[PDB]
Design a protein around this ligand. Structure first.
Ligand SMILES: *[C@@H]1O[C@H](CO)[C@@H](O)[C@H](O)[C@H]1NC(C)=O
Ligand SMILES: *[C@@H]1O[C@H](CO)[C@@H](O)[C@H](O)[C@H]1NC(C)=O
Ligand SMILES: *[C@@H]1O[C@H](CO)[C@@H](O)[C@H](O)[C@H]1NC(C)=O
Ligand SMILES: *[C@@H]1O[C@H](CO)[C@@H](O)[C@H](O)[C@H]1NC(C)=O
Ligand SMILES: *[C@@H]1O[C@H](CO)[C@@H](O)[C@H](O)[C@H]1NC(C)=O
Ligand SMILES: *[C@@H]1O[C@H](CO)[C@@H](O)[C@H](O)[C@H]1NC(C)=O
Ligand SMILES: *[C@@H]1O[C@H](CO)[C@@H](O)[C@H](O)[C@H]1NC(C)=O
Ligand SMILES: *[C@@H]1O[C@H](CO)[C@@H](O)[C@H](O)[C@H]1NC(C)=O
Ligand SMILES: *[C@@H]1O[C@H](CO)[C@@H](O)[C@H](O)[C@H]1NC(C)=O
Length: 336
């Protein structure tokens, strides 16, 4: 079998009666999943995997972009010199698991190694028809509603010596963060709550995996975002069709030397688009309480670099990194 680039088709459990945009897009661009997927483990076979050059990350990415271009209609969209204005009605926004599968003559390989670091060989390979349900969660600094690692915290980078490369952290235990726009004074003011002690344990367990990649003479320190667009400066995401911008300063101030962490949040109308370079405008925040509990299953940090003391700051920006943390243990091959 050889790795080829084909036209994938997505599968989903989308209800036709649900008017939530993901359920509507998936009842249009996807197919009903198979209740009994046949995963066949390959005997005595070792294959090469590369998550950093996977095509499925691309086709998924374009599908999410095409999804958003039909789902979240902005009032004003501004790209390089051109202006796009249209109706901007608020909708139901709750990401549904999207399964990706291979066409006829093709199959999907799956690495089952418990320590797989992203690139290299694999001794435990199987062949499934469709990938697992990947919730297309668009967020920064922290990954959400994703798939946890089976064993330990498997940090992954394209080049660890390269400080410009994003290290995608995959947790083995999740932390639940509850974000809330109180009903009520300020319709843009919101917040999020998570366990303070549960969070300091993650920063500690991660700082051990970081001493296994850069040396045990290193002192791991976590600092906030350096600068840039608020999308990567704060923990930006989308809860209830609203774009939250949670200041994660308290999340990224740590050293090895209350009980709840409350992140000050802000519902913003103007968004720096991730699909392409530009800006988008949406209607003012809706009425009532906007709230959704999420599971922090992964991270997106970076390294400063440039001796002894290693500083790590929250990253993000490229939503392909979001897909890779789910589409790493996979590849498309052509069966003869
Ligand atoms: C993968 O190989 C076998 C299952 O096929 C298993 O015994 C072994 O522990 C796995 N490898 C790792 C990384 O543990
Ligand atoms: C969870 O991760 C911790 C270290 O971060 C590890 O010690 C533990 O074995 C993991 N739990 C399981 C059951 O994978
Ligand atoms: C890894 O990153 C370093 C620093 O950017 C670079 O000099 C080196 O060429 C890279 N190594 C690889 C894998 O080519
Ligand atoms: C988050 O809300 C969940 C229910 O969704 C609850 O179990 C938990 O106590 C809340 N956590 C925090 C830190 O508020
Ligand atoms: C690094 O580890 C070696 C191991 O013996 C130790 O001698 C040395 O003091 C350490 N150096 C630093 C930079 O901490
Ligand atoms: C949020 O972070 C900003 C700087 O990024 C800081 O000035 C502010 O004090 C933080 N808010 C709170 C209440 O922690
Ligand atoms: C580092 O650790 C000390 C003691 O826990 C704490 O008071 C201080 O705020 C921390 N500051 C950093 C991140 O250097
Ligand atoms: C995670 O999933 C839950 C349940 O669908 C949802 O309420 C929440 O908004 C999701 N989080 C994000 C940021 O997509
Ligand atoms: C968090 O999400 C997982 C699967 O994504 C789900 O099983 C679980 O019920 C959710 N909440 C928690 C922390 O149990």
């Amino acid at each position: 079998w050889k790795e080829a680039t084909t036209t994938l088709f997505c599968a989903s459990d989308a209800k036709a009666y649900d008017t939530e945009v993901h359920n509507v897009w998936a009842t249009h661009a996807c197919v009903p999943t198979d209740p009994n997927p046949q995963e066949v483990k390959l005997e005595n076979v070792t294959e090469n995997f590369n998550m950093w050059k996977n095509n499925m990350v691309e086709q998924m990415h374009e599908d999410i972009i095409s999804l958003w271009d039909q789902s979240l209609k902005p009032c004003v969209k501004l790209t390089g010199g051109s202006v796009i204005t249209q109706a901007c009605p608020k909708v139901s926004f709750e990401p549904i698991p999207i399964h990706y599968c291979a066409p006829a003559g093709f199959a999907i390989l799956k690495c089952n190694d418990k320590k797989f670091n992203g690139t290299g060989p694999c001794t435990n390979v199987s062949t499934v028809q469709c990938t697992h349900g990947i919730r297309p969660v668009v967020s920064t600094q922290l990954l959400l509603n994703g798939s946890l690692a089976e064993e330990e915290i498997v940090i992954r980078s394209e080049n660890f010596t390269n400080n410009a490369k994003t290290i995608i952290v995959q947790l083995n235990e999740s932390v639940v963060i509850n974000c809330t726009r109180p009903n009520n004074g300020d319709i843009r003011q919101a917040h999020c709550n998570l366990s303070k002690t549960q969070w300091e344990n993650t920063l500690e367990q991660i700082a051990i995996k970081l001493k296994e990649q850069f040396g045990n003479n290193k002192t791991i320190i976590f600092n906030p975002s350096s600068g840039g667009d608020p999308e990567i400066v704060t923990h930006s995401f989308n809860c209830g069709g609203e774009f939250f911008y949670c200041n994660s300063t308290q999340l990224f101030t740590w050293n090895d030397t209350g009980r709840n962490i409350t992140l000050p949040c802000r519902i913003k109308q103007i968004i720096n688009m991730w699909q392409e370079v530009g800006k988008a405008m949406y209607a003012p925040p809706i009425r009532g309480q906007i709230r959704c509990s999420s599971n922090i299953t992964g991270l997106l940090l970076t390294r400063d670099g440039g001796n002894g003391t290693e500083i790590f700051r929250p990253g993000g920006g490229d939503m392909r990194d979001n897909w890779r943390s789910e589409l790493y243990k996979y590849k498309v091959v052509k069966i003869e």
